[PDB]
Design a protein around this ligand. Structure first.
Ligand SMILES: *C/C=C(C)/C=C/C=C(C)/C=C/C1=C(C)CCCC1(C)C
Length: 137
């Protein structure tokens, strides 16, 4: 696989339900769904090392990791966490997150390159899975 690319979102599902689990109130949920509908993801993959840039209209974040090596990022609702990415197949990876402080829902994300050329990202909190689908710009 090669995840490298400038990816633009075409579909965004269940993001409000995810934010509901994470405690966000209704109006901020609606505004965040609108922001998530503009998500863009830039990936540079060098073997098992990933440089990712995730952005919306007013915000951008850089996430750099190596498969199998712990790193620090933040959960979807913004709490710092320790993360660990593993492959689950040739074209899909899964990240488990553990909070640095306090407690919360169990959170994770996945990234998958499909045979049709799409990038599928999911974000999970407990039983609620959000699915974002992207195509190359
Ligand atoms: C490989 C892809 C990764 C690690 C994607 C991470 C995405 C996020 C942490 C999502 C952030 C968003 C919000 C919290 C609300 C506004 C829009 C998003 C989708 C950028």
């Amino acid at each position: 696989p090669n995840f490298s690319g400038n990816w633009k979102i075409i579909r965004s599902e269940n993001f409000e339900e995810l934010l509901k689990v994470l405690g966000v109130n209704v109006m901020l949920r609606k505004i965040a769904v609108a922001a998530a509908s503009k998500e863009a993801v830039e990936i540079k993959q060098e073997g098992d090392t990933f440089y990712i840039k995730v952005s919306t209209t007013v915000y951008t974040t850089e996430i750099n990791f190596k498969v199998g090596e712990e790193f620090e990022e933040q959960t979807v609702d913004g709490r710092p966490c320790k993360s660990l990415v593993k492959w689950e197949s040739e074209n899909k990876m899964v990240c488990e997150q553990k909070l640095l402080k306090g407690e919360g829902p169990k959170t994770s994300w996945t990234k998958e390159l499909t045979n049709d050329g799409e990038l599928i990202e999911t974000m999970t909190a407990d039983d609620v899975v959000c699915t974002q689908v992207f195509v190359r710009e």
